[PDB]
Design an enzyme around this catalytic site. Structure first.
Site, PDB file in Angstrom:
ATOM      1  CD1 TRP G  24      -9.169  -4.663  -5.866  1.00  8.00           C
ATOM      2  CD2 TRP G  24      -7.079  -5.350  -6.250  1.00  8.00           C
ATOM      3  NE1 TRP G  24      -9.081  -5.010  -7.190  1.00  8.00           N
ATOM      4  CE2 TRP G  24      -7.809  -5.439  -7.450  1.00  8.00           C
ATOM      5  CE3 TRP G  24      -5.738  -5.738  -6.248  1.00  8.00           C
ATOM      6  CZ2 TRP G  24      -7.240  -5.893  -8.634  1.00  8.00           C
ATOM      7  CZ3 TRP G  24      -5.175  -6.185  -7.427  1.00  8.00           C
ATOM      8  CH2 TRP G  24      -5.925  -6.261  -8.602  1.00  8.00           C
ATOM      9  CE1 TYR G  57     -10.049  -1.415  -6.740  1.00  9.55           C
ATOM     10  CE2 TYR G  57      -9.607  -0.672  -4.509  1.00  9.55           C
ATOM     11  CZ  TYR G  57      -9.214  -0.829  -5.818  1.00  9.55           C
ATOM     12  OH  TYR G  57      -7.976  -0.398  -6.214  1.00  9.55           O
ATOM     13  CD  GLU G 299       5.731 -13.551   6.542  1.00  9.74           C
ATOM     14  OE1 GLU G 299       4.651 -14.174   6.499  1.00  9.74           O
ATOM     15  OE2 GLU G 299       6.689 -13.794   5.784  1.00  9.74           O
TER      16      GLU G 299
HETATM   17  N1  LIG Z   1      -4.020   2.822  -8.217  1.00  9.64           N
HETATM   18  C1  LIG Z   1      -4.647   1.620  -8.737  1.00  9.64           C
HETATM   19  O1  LIG Z   1      -5.210   1.647  -9.776  1.00  9.64           O
HETATM   20  C2  LIG Z   1      -4.574   0.316  -7.946  1.00  9.64           C
HETATM   21  C3  LIG Z   1      -4.745  -0.870  -8.579  1.00  9.64           C
HETATM   22  C4  LIG Z   1      -4.682  -2.031  -7.885  1.00  9.64           C
HETATM   23  C5  LIG Z   1      -4.440  -1.996  -6.523  1.00  9.64           C
HETATM   24  N2  LIG Z   1      -4.267  -0.810  -5.894  1.00  9.64           N
HETATM   25  C6  LIG Z   1      -4.023  -0.778  -4.476  1.00  9.64           C
HETATM   26  O2  LIG Z   1      -3.006  -1.699  -4.132  1.00  9.64           O
HETATM   27  C7  LIG Z   1      -3.254  -2.132  -2.927  1.00  9.64           C
HETATM   28  C8  LIG Z   1      -2.466  -3.440  -2.653  1.00  9.64           C
HETATM   29  O3  LIG Z   1      -3.180  -4.514  -3.201  1.00  9.64           O
HETATM   30  P1  LIG Z   1      -2.351  -5.876  -3.610  1.00  9.64           P
HETATM   31  O4  LIG Z   1      -3.152  -7.067  -3.148  1.00  9.64           O
HETATM   32  O5  LIG Z   1      -2.171  -5.931  -5.105  1.00  9.64           O
HETATM   33  O6  LIG Z   1      -0.877  -5.842  -2.870  1.00  9.64           O
HETATM   34  P2  LIG Z   1       0.116  -7.143  -2.638  1.00  9.64           P
HETATM   35  O7  LIG Z   1       0.762  -7.024  -1.280  1.00  9.64           O
HETATM   36  O8  LIG Z   1       1.184  -7.155  -3.700  1.00  9.64           O
HETATM   37  O9  LIG Z   1      -0.733  -8.555  -2.694  1.00  9.64           O
HETATM   38  C9  LIG Z   1      -0.347  -9.580  -1.816  1.00  9.64           C
HETATM   39  C10 LIG Z   1      -1.326 -10.781  -1.942  1.00  9.64           C
HETATM   40  O10 LIG Z   1      -0.709 -11.902  -1.661  1.00  9.64           O
HETATM   41  C11 LIG Z   1      -1.154 -12.444  -0.428  1.00  9.64           C
HETATM   42  N3  LIG Z   1      -0.196 -12.194   0.623  1.00  9.64           N
HETATM   43  C12 LIG Z   1      -0.012 -11.086   1.346  1.00  9.64           C
HETATM   44  N4  LIG Z   1       0.984 -11.305   2.206  1.00  9.64           N
HETATM   45  C13 LIG Z   1       1.418 -12.557   2.018  1.00  9.64           C
HETATM   46  C14 LIG Z   1       2.411 -13.287   2.629  1.00  9.64           C
HETATM   47  N5  LIG Z   1       3.359 -13.014   3.685  1.00  9.64           N
HETATM   48  N6  LIG Z   1       2.645 -14.532   2.250  1.00  9.64           N
HETATM   49  C15 LIG Z   1       1.908 -15.093   1.260  1.00  9.64           C
HETATM   50  N7  LIG Z   1       0.931 -14.374   0.660  1.00  9.64           N
HETATM   51  C16 LIG Z   1       0.690 -13.108   1.042  1.00  9.64           C
HETATM   52  C17 LIG Z   1      -2.316 -11.934  -0.091  1.00  9.64           C
HETATM   53  O11 LIG Z   1      -3.474 -12.846  -0.378  1.00  9.64           O
HETATM   54  P3  LIG Z   1      -3.308 -14.343  -1.056  1.00  9.64           P
HETATM   55  O12 LIG Z   1      -2.465 -15.237  -0.176  1.00  9.64           O
HETATM   56  O13 LIG Z   1      -4.678 -14.961  -1.183  1.00  9.64           O
HETATM   57  O14 LIG Z   1      -2.696 -14.241  -2.431  1.00  9.64           O
HETATM   58  C18 LIG Z   1      -2.459 -10.648  -0.918  1.00  9.64           C
HETATM   59  O15 LIG Z   1      -3.662 -10.631  -1.542  1.00  9.64           O
HETATM   60  C19 LIG Z   1      -4.761  -2.425  -2.936  1.00  9.64           C
HETATM   61  O16 LIG Z   1      -5.265  -2.399  -1.683  1.00  9.64           O
HETATM   62  C20 LIG Z   1      -5.283  -1.244  -3.758  1.00  9.64           C
HETATM   63  O17 LIG Z   1      -5.791  -0.170  -2.854  1.00  9.64           O
HETATM   64  C21 LIG Z   1      -4.332   0.350  -6.584  1.00  9.64           C
END
Ligand SMILES: NC(=O)c1ccc[n+]([C@@H]2O[C@H](COP(=O)([O-])OP(=O)(O)OC[C@H]3O[C@@H](n4cnc5c(N)ncnc54)[C@H](OP(=O)(O)O)[C@@H]3O)[C@@H](O)[C@H]2O)c1
Ligand SMILES: NC(=O)c1ccc[n+]([C@@H]2O[C@H](COP(=O)([O-])OP(=O)(O)OC[C@H]3O[C@@H](n4cnc5c(N)ncnc54)[C@H](OP(=O)(O)O)[C@@H]3O)[C@@H](O)[C@H]2O)c1
Ligand SMILES: NC(=O)c1ccc[n+]([C@@H]2O[C@H](COP(=O)([O-])OP(=O)(O)OC[C@H]3O[C@@H](n4cnc5c(N)ncnc54)[C@H](OP(=O)(O)O)[C@@H]3O)[C@@H](O)[C@H]2O)c1
Ligand SMILES: NC(=O)c1ccc[n+]([C@@H]2O[C@H](COP(=O)([O-])OP(=O)(O)OC[C@H]3O[C@@H](n4cnc5c(N)ncnc54)[C@H](OP(=O)(O)O)[C@@H]3O)[C@@H](O)[C@H]2O)c1
EC number: 1.1.1.-
Lengths: 328, 106, 328, 106, 106, 106, 328, 328
Positions: G24, G57, G299
């Protein structure tokens, strides 16, 4: 009402003429390639669209010359019906029978020799006691679903084996056969007349008969003896000569003289009457012919004019002279 | 006339019965025992014989073949319906005589 | 609410516009290739995604020019719906009908002429009495499973034949049809209104109607006589001219004058009212149009504005003037 | 209104019955004899009509069609259940009169 | 001799019965409880055992296995037919003794 | 707890019954009306529930659900077998009281 | 016990790690190609074999860069699990939905962008009310039997739709789905905990959860405000910023401070506890992660060490602080 | 009556010789390529058509040299029977087992190493507890229907697993297996003699036994000690040496001396009697051999002459000396 008069092969949607041309002893063997091209052009110009060969005939040379003529003359594939038969493929143990391996490999080798993409009907040449029926029906359904064939049929099977193939196909949702090749002439009358109409009325399996002139016996040329350049004078055919020269052949020649008198009264020749007698019932879809030169083929095509002249009195007179009608 | 080993499926208004061919060909004078009479009821798409007839009588009709000739009316079915079934399936005259002897009044 | 307003074709997931463009007498025949390209560009720019042709139309030249325009203009394949119809393929006996051989060969030849990999819907153009239904449904399921088509439908079939095709498909676990092409205009009202809604409510088979203007009769151009460069003045169309010049055509012209008065009261033209009258019920999914020049197509597209103005009083007045409503 | 040759499958709580369409269209005034009334019970995924009703009564209901109009209650089923089945399948008033005449008390 | 979990289909003239293998192997001295005796009735194309025998007796035969040994003749079936079925399915001598005790006269 | 429209197949020793889910969920306190109790009888390869139990009792068990609560013993089945079936399918105490009231002696 | 500890996906034979990497907003958008290659190399060297993308995407640019990295680094195809999702494919009417045409065309376009021959699992991204279920299950079975995929699953479906797909597949002898993608974090607990274990125990459908950190809310970076170069500060993400700045976000930040005190007592960081809390039950097979740089991914991988330290007392304390446990 | 005497493999239509050649430790390992070509030419000239390999044998080098010899010598494909076994394919988690992904990828990699289009039988090398049976039977049916194999069988399965595979195949209209590979020699007699004839009489599953000489123990060469250049002296085979040098090996050597006295009385050698003892019953279809040089293979082929000399008295004497007959 046989050639350029079309009818369905069994109860399927495939329509054939009721005279076809066969690729036995002549093609690749007895005759040359130019005579074979002349015979195929003469058959195609009169409306015959059915041509039949096998993988055992002269070790594939008949299929090679049949594929050469079609590619030379430039005919469309959608106006021709081509059939092949598969049982014998080589000297090894795994190169004969009706298993899955030999059916797939033999059909691929036949299509490579014929320079074609598919055939119309693929026949099993004789039954196999070493293979289950389910494996045979699954292999035939497989080669139909892959696009290498359109239909399949049997040859020299009994009625129990055809009904077993039908019941296996209905059990496992497979494809049943549509046709059966049987021998039928004036001295071989049992199977086509007493066993096949029940199968045609029950499960819709038609018949495509072969050898209408008993390899040249009913044509009336062997009355004096064995003429040169005939099929009985060829090497490897001592059995036909021993059949002709025996004591049954003299009675067959006397009955052929009486039938020649009947055919001369009707206004035609004896091979025309003998060919048109096989098509007098509706259970026979087509008759496969054989010819060595073009005069024989042009004479054999002329049974169309003598087919509507066969009334019931002439059929009763022929049955009285022959005297071998089977009992129902 | 071997009748050997082949299985026959008979469908009576959606209720299915199976038997062997040598069971049916013990009585060649009946409707099911003769191939010329039962051939007009064959269904080629399903490999079965179909009859649009009464359902609780064919258990007794099949037990006539399986027991070698014993006629026994079911308790639920009345006299006239079972008599019409015996007349349709062409079991003969001695089956009617055994039915009248088993039913009393005859 | 017809073109650039989309709806499902039957109960399937395929969504079409309710106006399409047809590849009959004009393409490859009456008009040139540049006019055909202009008509296709004008239809595509207004949101029409449905285009319909056949293998019998000008012996394949309509399919050739339709495949040339698509490859020239560079449109994406996923934004178009292309249909073909297969019954007549040549002069030989095996090149017509609905057998397995002709369905496979005709669809391959049509895809080779169209320069495409697949079509969307393939139609059977008319019913075949010489073929079993099971062979037809198995051949259609075969060409769908090989990737040469996505759906299939029927044309000029009765309700018993469509229900028989559905029951065979449900019996042998095959694919049922989704659509039916029927004729429907103001003087041909029986089949679409009394026979097809039962099939649509029962088994979900939609309708795609053709000839909404009765080859130009309902358009109101033949009142004075036969104008030059019309369809009735072309060679090979004496039957349409004899239909127009007969005694029924005068009563049709008088009723067309009264309907023209109604359409002039509504604020539009008579072909727009005649096209929008066919789409007033939900059982019709699409209407196929025909046009000779771009002014006719730009006028025929304008029935979208007059479709929501059809109240029940205007429909009752049209039924009172016409007087041919079928009885349920 | 030909009703010719087409077969109809009726499913009563998992118990399957088969008949021809010309058998059902002999009585066009009933639920099964009229196409407008039975169309809400059609199952398109299975090509059958489904009823979630009582199972031992439909043999008598089908024999009403197959015998030309004879009403006969099964021995197991009580009076009120069979009367409710006759009222549901809309056999008419003369079928109720024949049922009351055959059952005595009416 | 675990007999665990595998399901067995038994076909009696088109009427199908299903059970588990540990139900059948509670009585190893019978026809259905012993693998050497029932192996000649197996049909490999359909994965079932086929018997061309009487249909209303096998409900009582199966309830002999499912209830742990109780013999109860159906009301429709006569004495001699059920006795021949008990003799064919090889239930033993104590099943015959319980049948004669339940039937009175023995 | 909508229970809407989904069909359920119940297999009793090879005999198949079909119903809707809203018929079964009218009585949530029973074995078939509760999803936690019937989940150990589900067969995932065939999409059905399988019971290796007595066959002529489940018509009365299903008619208890389809009629809104009426208990009626079949004529063939004895008292103790039907009482054990009522105890297994967990119909409650008022079903036992209606069974004892309908059977006389209670 | 999540990454480089393998478990089955549902009840199938496919074994995945319990941490995956998601394609994503970062890939093709926020980050560069070199950072994406660094993240994929860091994920592959630690034992993660699951990578997940979609056709919507960044209009396919995520699939393009994901296919570039795999072809550059030379990894074997048999050691990777690649998934794609298909609902939205373009601006036309026929380029969205779950019909047969769009499923086949969208999977072919995705495989052409990814430079692959097949994917492992293909997901339906959301349910379609305009298509019958039988057409969807037949199209998924078709693309599995052609070799373009191995398995299929659903996303954002309810339990009735999954059970309907299973019953249609068992009715017509088709292929049932194996997986479901649902949203699951500390403030979204209902569906995974109360609806999916019944389906897992009945028909064996596993769960692959996404967004474990609520797009960065549970990570604890938005307590003071909106830092620069975050996801809330990007263009097109005003909804996340309005969610953070509202009155519910303050209560979420206070609860996050208490959970940070618990995670600091346990010896780890708050994102490690938040990721390892999702894997405490056996009904969840894998968790898909997101990361912008390599420090975040290094992390996030470290939740493996804190997964075995979750006793029942700590889970009860977390449920006492959160206060949103659903009732069974 | 073993080599150049052919019999069906189970109840299928495939006919094999009852001696085959195996592609274990020798090929690609212990012996050179020229010795392997000499052994294959010596086996093919005596009528042996069965050759058996696996993907784990020397990491594919046995398949590479086996594909080199066939392409060099120019033998026809229709006269050979080639088998492969698939369980172990690499170091990753997804490169082992009996899932759909590994079956398809492993068979494609084996066919690429062998330079062939298809194999005849594909075996599952050991059972998999992590995969459902339905997925395995569907993947085997898929690779048979795609033309990559003709038949399939099992190896080291129990009778319950084979019966479960048969019942799943009959339930979902799939393809059942035809064969089972089991270990069988004079000191391993239980499974082939007490468990497999019930399966052969019930569902028609044959047996193809391996290791007839117990890796060289029954050949009688280890009586004095461990000779150089044997299998026990090779690196990586300490387990066989510890088996030979233990206290059970001395009793086995004494019984081998008595059996050598019997075989010397019969007029032959001890390996010929040990090989021909495995073929004395009809439930065994073929025996796979191993050989390091050509003298061993020419000696091992000579069991054909000693097979008809085994009367019941000699079998009773062998059972009296051995003393390990299982109880039925
Ligand atoms: N089935 C579906 O319809 C659907 C829909 C949506 C997503 N998905 C899947 O979900 C997967 C996960 O995506 P997600 O981004 O929503 O998961 P997420 O882990 O909840 O998002 C974490 C976000 O916060 C930030 N982050 C990550 N680790 C961090 C940390 N230790 N400390 C501070 N910030 C951190 C990152 O960038 P930032 O710091 O810039 O915020 C990241 O974008 C996607 O790859 C996609 O394939 C599926
Ligand atoms: N299903 C099977 O297993 C099977 C087996 C065998 C054949 N067949 C088919 O049967 C087809 C027919 O072959 P066939 O030769 O046996 O049929 P045929 O017509 O009975 O043989 C006639 C033979 O007599 C000669 N002849 C033909 N017309 C003649 C005429 N007016 N006057 C004098 N002689 C004439 C011809 O050469 P000569 O003058 O030199 O004698 C010809 O070889 C073959 O093509 C083959 O495809 C099938
Ligand atoms: N399923 C089948 O078997 C079948 C059979 C036939 C046709 N079809 C389909 O039907 C489609 C429609 O063909 P069609 O021509 O019969 O439909 P149509 O709309 O009824 O024909 C209208 C004709 O009248 C003329 N016209 C069109 N608009 C006009 C206007 N505003 N004013 C005056 N004249 C106008 C046009 O040329 P002119 O002015 O020169 O008359 C046109 O040819 C075809 O494309 C074909 O695909 C299907
Ligand atoms: N299904 C499975 O999982 C599985 C497992 C293992 C093997 N197999 C199959 O089994 C087949 C047979 O392999 P195998 O080697 O175990 O069979 P084997 O015949 O029992 O082994 C005989 C060994 O002893 C030696 N030998 C052979 N003939 C001899 C003779 N006359 N005198 C003295 N020594 C002789 C040979 O080399 P040395 O003299 O150096 O000892 C040979 O390696 C293999 O090819 C493989 O395909 C299958």
């Amino acid at each position: 009402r046989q050639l350029q008069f079309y009818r369905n092969l069994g109860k399927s949607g495939l329509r054939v003429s009721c005279l076809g041309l066969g690729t036995w002893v002549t093609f690749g063997g007895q005759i040359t390639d130019e005579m074979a091209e002349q015979l195929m052009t003469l058959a195609y110009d009169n409306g015959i669209n059915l041509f039949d060969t096998a993988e055992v005939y002269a070790a594939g040379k008949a299929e090679v010359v049949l594929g050469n003529i079609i590619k030379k003359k430039g005919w469309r594939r959608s106006s021709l019906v081509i059939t092949t038969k598969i049982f014998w493929g080589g000297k090894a143990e795994t190169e004969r029978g009706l298993s899955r391996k030999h059916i797939i490999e033999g059909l691929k080798a036949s299509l490579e020799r014929l320079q074609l993409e598919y055939v119309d009907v693929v026949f099993a040449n004789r039954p196999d006691p070493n293979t289950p029926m389910e494996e045979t029906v699954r292999a035939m359904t497989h080669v139909i679903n892959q696009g290498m064939a359109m239909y399949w049929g049997t040859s020299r099977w009994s009625s129990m084996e055809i009904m077993e193939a039908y019941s296996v196909a209905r059990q496992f949702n497979l494809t049943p056969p549509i046709c059966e090749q049987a021998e039928y002439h004036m001295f071989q009358r049992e199977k086509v007349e007493v066993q096949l109409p029940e199968l045609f009325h029950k499960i819709g399996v038609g018949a495509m008969t072969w050898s209408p002139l008993a390899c040249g016996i009913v044509s009336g040329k062997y009355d004096s003896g064995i003429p040169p350049y005939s099929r009985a004078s060829l090497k490897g055919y001592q059995w036909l000569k021993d059949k002709i020269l025996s004591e049954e052949g003299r009675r067959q020649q006397a009955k052929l003289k009486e039938l020649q008198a009947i055919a001369e009264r009707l206004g035609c020749t004896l091979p025309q009457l003998a060919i048109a007698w096989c098509l007098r019932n509706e259970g026979v879809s087509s008759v496969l012919l054989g010819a060595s030169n073009a005069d024989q083929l042009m004479e054999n095509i002329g049974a169309i004019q003598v087919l509507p002249k066969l009334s019931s009195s002439i059929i009763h007179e022929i049955d009285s002279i022959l005297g071998n009608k089977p009992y129902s | 006339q071997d009748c050997c080993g082949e299985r026959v499926v008979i469908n009576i208004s959606g209720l299915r019965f199976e038997t062997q061919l040598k069971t049916l060909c013990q009585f060649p004078e009946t409707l099911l025992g003769d191939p010329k009479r039962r051939m007009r009821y064959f269904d080629p798409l399903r490999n079965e014989y179909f009859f649009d007839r009464n359902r609780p009588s064919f258990d007794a009709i099949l037990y006539y073949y399986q027991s070698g000739g014993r006629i026994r009316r079911p308790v639920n079915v009345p006299i006239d319906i079972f008599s019409e079934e015996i007349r349709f399936y062409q079991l003969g005259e001695e089956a009617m005589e055994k039915f009248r002897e088993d039913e009393g009044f005859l």
